[PDB]
Amino acid sequence: IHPPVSYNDTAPRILFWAQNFSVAYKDEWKDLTSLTFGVENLNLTGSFWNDSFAMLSLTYEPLFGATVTFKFILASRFYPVSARYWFTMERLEIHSNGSVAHFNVSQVTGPSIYSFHCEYVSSLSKKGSLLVTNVPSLWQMTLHNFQIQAFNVTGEQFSYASDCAGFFSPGIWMGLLTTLFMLFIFTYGLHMILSLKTMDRFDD
Amino acid sequence: SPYNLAYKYNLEYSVVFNLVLWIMTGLALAVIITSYNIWNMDPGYDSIIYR
Amino acid sequence: TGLELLYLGIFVAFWACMIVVGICYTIFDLGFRFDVAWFLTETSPFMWSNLGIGLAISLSVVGAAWGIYITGSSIIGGGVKAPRIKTKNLVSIIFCEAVAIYGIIMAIVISNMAEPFSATDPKAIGHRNYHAGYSMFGAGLTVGLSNLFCGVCVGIVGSGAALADAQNPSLFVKILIVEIFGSAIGLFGVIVAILQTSRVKMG
Amino acid sequence: NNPEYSSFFGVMGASSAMVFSAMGAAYGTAKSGTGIAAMSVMRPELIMKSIIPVVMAGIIAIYGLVVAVLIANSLTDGITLYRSFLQLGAGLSVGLSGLAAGFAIGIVGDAGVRGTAQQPRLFVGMILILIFAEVLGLYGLIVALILSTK
Amino acid sequence: NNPEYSSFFGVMGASSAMVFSAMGAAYGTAKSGTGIAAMSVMRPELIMKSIIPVVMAGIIAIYGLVVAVLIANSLTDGITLYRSFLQLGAGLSVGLSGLAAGFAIGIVGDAGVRGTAQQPRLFVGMILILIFAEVLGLYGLIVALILSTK
Amino acid sequence: NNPEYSSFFGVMGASSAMVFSAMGAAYGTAKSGTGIAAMSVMRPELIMKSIIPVVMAGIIAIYGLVVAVLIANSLTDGITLYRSFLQLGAGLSVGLSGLAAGFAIGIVGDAGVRGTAQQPRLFVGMILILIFAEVLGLYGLIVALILSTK
Amino acid sequence: NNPEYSSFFGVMGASSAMVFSAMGAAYGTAKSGTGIAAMSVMRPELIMKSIIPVVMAGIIAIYGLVVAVLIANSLTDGITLYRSFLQLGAGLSVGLSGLAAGFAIGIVGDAGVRGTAQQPRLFVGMILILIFAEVLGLYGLIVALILSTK
Amino acid sequence: NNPEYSSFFGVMGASSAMVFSAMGAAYGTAKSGTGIAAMSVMRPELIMKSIIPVVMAGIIAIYGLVVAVLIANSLTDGITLYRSFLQLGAGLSVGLSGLAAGFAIGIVGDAGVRGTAQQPRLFVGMILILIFAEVLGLYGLIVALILSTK
Amino acid sequence: NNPEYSSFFGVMGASSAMVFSAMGAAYGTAKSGTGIAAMSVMRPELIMKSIIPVVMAGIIAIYGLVVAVLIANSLTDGITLYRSFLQLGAGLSVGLSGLAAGFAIGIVGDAGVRGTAQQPRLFVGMILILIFAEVLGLYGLIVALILSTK
Amino acid sequence: NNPEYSSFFGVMGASSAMVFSAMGAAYGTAKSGTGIAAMSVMRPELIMKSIIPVVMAGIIAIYGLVVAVLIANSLTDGITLYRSFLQLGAGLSVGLSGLAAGFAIGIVGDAGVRGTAQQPRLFVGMILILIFAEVLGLYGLIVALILSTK
Amino acid sequence: NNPEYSSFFGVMGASSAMVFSAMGAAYGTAKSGTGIAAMSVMRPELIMKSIIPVVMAGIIAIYGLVVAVLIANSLTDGITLYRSFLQLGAGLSVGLSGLAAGFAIGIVGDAGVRGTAQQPRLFVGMILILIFAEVLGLYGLIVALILSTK
Amino acid sequence: NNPEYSSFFGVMGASSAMVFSAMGAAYGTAKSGTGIAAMSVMRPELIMKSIIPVVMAGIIAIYGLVVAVLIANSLTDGITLYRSFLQLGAGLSVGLSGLAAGFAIGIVGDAGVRGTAQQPRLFVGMILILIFAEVLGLYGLIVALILSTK
Numbered sequence A: 001i002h003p004p005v006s007y008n009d010t011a012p013r014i015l016f017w018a019q020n021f022s023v024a025y026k027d028e029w030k031d032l033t034s035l036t037f038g039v040e041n042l043n044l045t046g047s048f049w050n051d052s053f054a055m056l057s058l059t060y061e062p063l064f065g066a067t068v069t070f071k072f073i074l075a076s077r078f079y080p081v082s083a084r085y086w087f088t089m090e091r092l093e094i095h096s097n098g099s100v101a102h103f104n105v106s107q108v109t110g111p112s113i114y115s116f117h118c119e120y121v122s123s124l125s126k127k128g129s130l131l132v133t134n135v136p137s138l139w140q141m142t143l144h145n146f147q148i149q150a151f152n153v154t155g156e157q158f159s160y161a162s163d164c165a166g167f168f169s170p171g172i173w174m175g176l177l178t179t180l181f182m183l184f185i186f187t188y189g190l191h192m193i194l195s196l197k198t199m200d201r202f203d204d
Numbered sequence B: 001s002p003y004n005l006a007y008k009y010n011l012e013y014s015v016v017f018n019l020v021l022w023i024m025t026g027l028a029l030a031v032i033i034t035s036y037n038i039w040n041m042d043p044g045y046d047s048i049i050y051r
Numbered sequence C: 001t002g003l004e005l006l007y008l009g010i011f012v013a014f015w016a017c018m019i020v021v022g023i024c025y026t027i028f029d030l031g032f033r034f035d036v037a038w039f040l041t042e043t044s045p046f047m048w049s050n051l052g053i054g055l056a057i058s059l060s061v062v063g064a065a066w067g068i069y070i071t072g073s074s075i076i077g078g079g080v081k082a083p084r085i086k087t088k089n090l091v092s093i094i095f096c097e098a099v100a101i102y103g104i105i106m107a108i109v110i111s112n113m114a115e116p117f118s119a120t121d122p123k124a125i126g127h128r129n130y131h132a133g134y135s136m137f138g139a140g141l142t143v144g145l146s147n148l149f150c151g152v153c154v155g156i157v158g159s160g161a162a163l164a165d166a167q168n169p170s171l172f173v174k175i176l177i178v179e180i181f182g183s184a185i186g187l188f189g190v191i192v193a194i195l196q197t198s199r200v201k202m203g
Numbered sequence D, E, F, G, H, I, J, K, L: 001n002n003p004e005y006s007s008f009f010g011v012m013g014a015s016s017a018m019v020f021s022a023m024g025a026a027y028g029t030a031k032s033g034t035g036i037a038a039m040s041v042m043r044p045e046l047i048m049k050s051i052i053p054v055v056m057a058g059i060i061a062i063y064g065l066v067v068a069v070l071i072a073n074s075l076t077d078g079i080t081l082y083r084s085f086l087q088l089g090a091g092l093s094v095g096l097s098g099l100a101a102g103f104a105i106g107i108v109g110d111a112g113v114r115g116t117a118q119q120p121r122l123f124v125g126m127i128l129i130l131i132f133a134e135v136l137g138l139y140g141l142i143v144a145l146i147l148s149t150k
Helices: A170-194 B013-039 C002-027 C036-042 C045-079 C091-113 C127-167 C171-175 C177-197 D004-042 D044-050 D052-072 D081-118 D122-148 E007-040 E044-050 E052-074 E081-118 E120-149 F007-039 F044-050 F052-074 F081-118 F122-148 G007-040 G044-050 G052-072 G081-118 G122-148 H006-042 H052-072 H082-118 H122-148 I007-040 I052-073 I081-118 I122-149 J004-040 J052-072 J081-118 J122-148 K007-040 K044-050 K052-074 K081-118 K122-148 L004-039 L052-073 L081-118 L122-148
Strands: A005-009 A011-017 A020-025 A028-031 A053-060 A068-075 A086-095 A100-104 A109-111 A115-117 A120-122 A139-144 A147-149 A161-163
Touching: A005 A053, A011 A053, A086 A139, A109 A115, A109 A161, A170 B013, A170 C002, A170 C036, A170 C045, A170 E007, A170 E081, A170 G081, B013 C002, B013 I007, B013 I081, B013 K081, C036 C127, C036 D004, C045 C091, C045 C127, C045 C177, C045 E081, C045 E120, C091 C127, C091 C177, C091 E120, C127 C171, C127 C177, C127 D004, C171 C177, C171 D004, C171 D044, C177 D004, C177 D052, D004 D044, D004 D052, D004 D081, D004 D122, D044 D052, D044 D081, D052 D081, D052 D122, D081 D122, D081 F007, D122 F007, D122 F044, D122 F052, E007 E044, E007 E052, E007 E081, E007 E120, E007 G081, E007 G122, E044 E052, E044 E081, E044 G122, E052 E081, E052 E120, E052 G122, E081 E120, F007 F044, F007 F052, F007 F081, F007 F122, F044 F052, F044 F081, F052 F081, F052 F122, F081 F122, F081 H006, F122 H006, F122 H052, G007 G044, G007 G052, G007 G081, G007 G122, G007 I081, G007 I122, G044 G052, G044 G081, G044 G122, G044 I122, G052 G081, G052 G122, G052 I122, G081 G122, H006 H052, H006 H082, H006 H122, H052 H082, H052 H122, H082 H122, H082 J004, H122 J004, H122 J052, I007 I052, I007 I081, I007 I122, I007 K081, I007 K122, I052 I081, I052 I122, I052 K122, I081 I122, J004 J052, J004 J081, J004 J122, J052 J081, J052 J122, J081 J122, J081 L004, J122 L004, J122 L052, K007 K044, K007 K052, K007 K081, K007 K122, K007 L081, K007 L122, K044 K052, K044 K081, K044 L122, K052 K081, K052 K122, K052 L122, K081 K122, L004 L052, L004 L081, L004 L122, L052 L081, L052 L122, L081 L122
Parallel strands: A115 A161
Antiparallel strands: A005 A011, A011 A147, A020 A028, A020 A139, A053 A068, A068 A086, A086 A100, A086 A109, A115 A147, A120 A139
16 A cells, blocks of 8 residues: 655644546646655655644656646634534645646535545546636646545544545435425325226116 | 555445435335235135135 | 335335434434535525425415315215206315415416526525525425415315205305315415515525 | 525424414314314304304414514524524424314314204303314414524 | 536426326326216217316326427526426426316316216306316416426 | 534424424314213213313423423523433423323323213213323423423 | 436436336226226127227337337437436336326226226217327327437 | 533433333323223223223333433433433333333223223233233333443 | 446346246236136136136246346446446336236236136137237337347 | 444343333233233133233243343443444344244234133143243343353 | 455345245245135145145245355355346345245135135146246246356 | 454344244244134144144244354354355345245144134145245255355
């Protein structure tokens, strides 16, 4: 198993892992995994951590002939209704040599006690489109089996993970709240139609 | 696993589940209803039920 | 028997599973799942709005049809031996149809409140817009079910009136007051749906 | 401020308040009206006494209306989640108590007119039994006012 | 652009409009065909008059058809959820209304057919009561024509 | 400190105290009121004695009301989560014990009233049995008072 | 771009057209065939005419088959969800309209066939009401052809 | 330290202990009151002596209360979940055993009372079969005390 | 490459084709066999003609076998969901159309045979009616063959 | 360390041993007391010897008590899931085997007592049948002792 | 390597194959046994011939056993999902086709044995019917063997 | 290593082996007791012989017990999930097959003993048919032994 990236400041603070980490510039894909996991000399410059904010930072110098830095921006607002702190990755920023490409990250959220896991944090629709660009972009990314934890970490071991895929989805709830509503209505239809009867006799 | 990595639950999992749950509940109701209907079908032996 | 055992079996298996799920999500400490906030937020406001519109009609029409079949069947059954029944007793049909009209008015009003958000994110949608979706659902369901029960009521008491009238004609106008107390229920369903609708705006 | 779904429970308050009271008042009136009409053939003079179960079932529809009006006039997109749950409690508490009162009024109204047409002395008893039925709608209203206006 | 599932609610809209009005018109026709059978043995001359509740049940399913065609002609892959849910609304709104009106036409038809047979003065009464039952299907149609064109 | 939704349990407490006590008292009143109505045709003098079942069904409604008022006046915007669950517990404890007491007052009341019209001696026996039906409401109240004030 | 799992809706379309049309035509046939065989004992001359309800029940199954074939020959690996839901809509829309028509054909077949033996004039009446029962399968078809071709 | 939801189970303990015992005692008293009422028609003397099935149903209501007070007096903020599950098991164990005892007291109370009229020698048998019904409430208590005080 | 778990639906297709057609053929056989058995007492010669509904019911099980075997032969671990769904829909299409046909065959077998013993002229009619009941299985099979081989 | 929820299953085990055996012994007592009471009018002397079904019903509740005590004394905050699951199994094993034994003791006891009333020889038979009933509760106990001590 | 929650489906295969086949053979045995018992009173000599339906039901259990054994021997820790689903499909296909054949044999055995005692010529018709009944168990076996070795 | 929940399936296996076999043995004992008792009025001698169906119902509980003990001895904290699923399958496979056997022994026992009292020759037929019922549990046991040991 590839060792997780572990941002260390007085103790381990941010743990990060994937089955496969890859990116593309102008749709030319590269595998970053051997350039990242278990690499003792890995360049974590510009990384930071706080009680209520965190910034994981991964810098590659030989990548696409340019110094490229990947920023993960994570928040942990208290949420009043839920009454638990909830972790939310807010943005992923590709700090390229010339400019910054911005990706919002969609469903990357979980209760603070627990970590987060997803099968495909990615900019591609074939792999869920969790990374969103509101504008045209030269960049693509995929984190196959992405797992992250960035507050109240203990040791180098991840805590239990909330998965990005539960038993239901917004599309399924809208689907079921129609289907398993109109099947109540069709059952009324079916109960009356199946209650049709015919005479056993006819008149003199 | 030494790092306590997640159970790798896939995307589409809500879709697999709502396929398998509702297909199996449909099949299991179709079996149960049919089985109830044949098990409680009238055996129709009126020529001897009274003698 | 068989359909009652099927509905009881589904109802019991459903609520037994919701008990087991409610216990299991609680004791495993999965309270960050069962996120009713996520359900009500990511389930589109358009769904709630349109279930409200379509139910405001169809439940009112299900009430008025139930009402018509009940009083109209006694009208015809008594009208065999008392041909006078067909005129005066038609008010119980007209009051059933009034319960559908209360539905149609209220569903047209709710339909005139429906508008495109052009938004796909909860903060971009914003509170007024979720509040429209839900209050339009509630208005439509309030009128819809209040008219359903009012239609069941008017037809039932209209059957009462028509079977009594068939025996003694002088009874009809005296009994007919009960259909007014029935038809009040649908009107109260309309007044509530008006008030639930009165503050909404989609956009 | 409040969450976006906050007003959902308060809306289901107003809707429950009316719908279950419409169900109560409709069953209370439907059941009573069958009694009244069937009874009236034997005793045509008794209709003006025998309407009282129906007026009682009409009061249950008014209880559902009152709380649904107070809740609906107290809804906004800005509503705090605490008040929104109290409004749901109010709406169920009048609505299902209105339903409970409607059931009782309907059952005792029908038995009461039928008894009364054989024995006119039941009439005082019927009014007492209807008071003890209809007061459940009032208790549903009391609890629902205390919740909805807090 | 719009969500992957978006067109599905308009599709079930088109389906429900035809299916539920079919169920209503089927029941309408089955009850009326039973009443016609029990009536014809005594009054065979009356059939061509006693067809009224059957043809009216067939009209209810045309109100379903009209909407299911309008919704289906309005579908596309790129449909916004607003237009899709308006079309599901049109779907249930004609659908269950036609279903309910079909139930009233069936039951009033079976009675009206058996009643007219014993008492020719009811033929106009059955036509009138069924016109109220058909108008309940027309109300579902009116809102479904509004929603499918909104 | 506490979940903003926490009050929802205590609110279902206040509602359930009221609602299930009303359903208890409604059933107690419906069932025994039917008994009084039929009974009063044979023994008209018993109206103003046979009412006791109905009076005690009203008392179960009062137990629901006491706890529902106690909870509703004890709710607050920021309610401590375990103090909210105590209020739910109180509300179901009195509410459903009220329903159980209502079931017994209903069936004892109906049978005891008919029986007393057959047997003038039964009245003392019926009252002793009704006290053993109505005290269930009171035990429901005792638990709910203790929980709601723990 | 096209997701996985897209086939389920289109395939359940094809299957639902066939299955529910077969259920329809099986109820239409079971009731008609009961009617014919219970009737014909007294009237051998009617066997070769009283088959018509069963022939019309067969035609509902054919409308099912038409749509189920038209769907099955228009599926592709990675079909877009829009065409796939349309194929579900077409599927249900004929299938359940055929089921509804199946109930109607069944009842008019049973009552109309059995009635005919005591009254020959009913047979032409039975044909007309049976066209009104059959044509719901055809409205189901018309909607299903439309949806499956958008 | 201890979980947020922990006291909900402790509450469900107290509430269930009461509610299911009230249901048991209510059923025991409803059946027994039916039996005593219908029995008394030809047996004045037995009206007092026959109340023992009701008294034993009233004891089941106290087994519910005892555990419900014992649980209620031990609920607090800090409860370590383990004690709350113990309390739920206690509340279900007495509660549902009270429900089973109440079912049995009902059936043996009705049949036993009717038989006691027919044959007064049955009365000692009715006491013996009732000791064996009432003791199920006591076993329900014993387990509940042990769990709620482990 | 493509999804694992994909096999499940294809496997369920094979099982559905067999199981539901076996339920259809069991119902068809069973209902028909009650007819043959009860008939044979009155007409001991008709036994060997009267088997045909049982034989046609058996053929429904053959249709389900044909599809189930064709599906099972067409399974693989790597099966694209397109083929897996096509197999499920094929499975249900024959399985449930065979169930429908089996219902029809059971009813028209029993009614056909009981009628035929009272009037031998019905035998041809029972065969013609039964062909329209059995062809539904053949239509189900056609759609299943088209789907599973698409 | 072990999960905090782990004690839950053991507690539901203890509750289950008591609850399901109380349901068993209640049903066995209810049916037995019905049979005894119905017998007594014709055979006043047999009511003593006919207690034995009730005694065996009592013994099923004692088995469920024993396992409910043994489970209830074997609980701690840190209890390993392995052991808690043993306790749940033990609870359901005695519990539902006691319920099974209770269904047997009841049906056997009623029919056996009402048979013995008419037939003094049957007693010697029915005690052997009651033993072959009550041993189910003992088998349940054996598996529960075996499970709870692994 | 391979995921767990994968040997489970194959176990459900083996279990289903035994369980639903034993249910099928039980309903076949039970119905036939009621037939044979009631039959033997009128025709004591036919017992030894009329055992056939019981033994025809008997083979369904054995078909279940064959597949249960074949699946059970083919299980392993970390079984490939594809092989495990195949074992589920087999296990259902035999188990539930066995169930269908169980009912088919039960109904035609009960009717056929009764008929045979009134008319000995039915003996051949009965066993001819029991072919097209028992063959459903065999078809469940055929597909189950195909799936189990695919 | 295993997950914490691993032993759950194996324990539900041990319990299900006992529970459902005790239910099969209870049903067979209850129906057999009813038959034996009800007929002994005409046949004082046959009570000593007619016990055999009760003994066979008892034997089904023994088959449950055997597997329940064999599973329960094969439990440990460290159990691999594969062996834990095998133990659940084994437990259901004997338990529900025992329930099927018990159904058959119940029906055959009741009908068989009634018939035997009307015709003593039936006793041999009843014993043969009961062995065909009882062996269904033994087939369930074979599969449970095969599953629990591989």
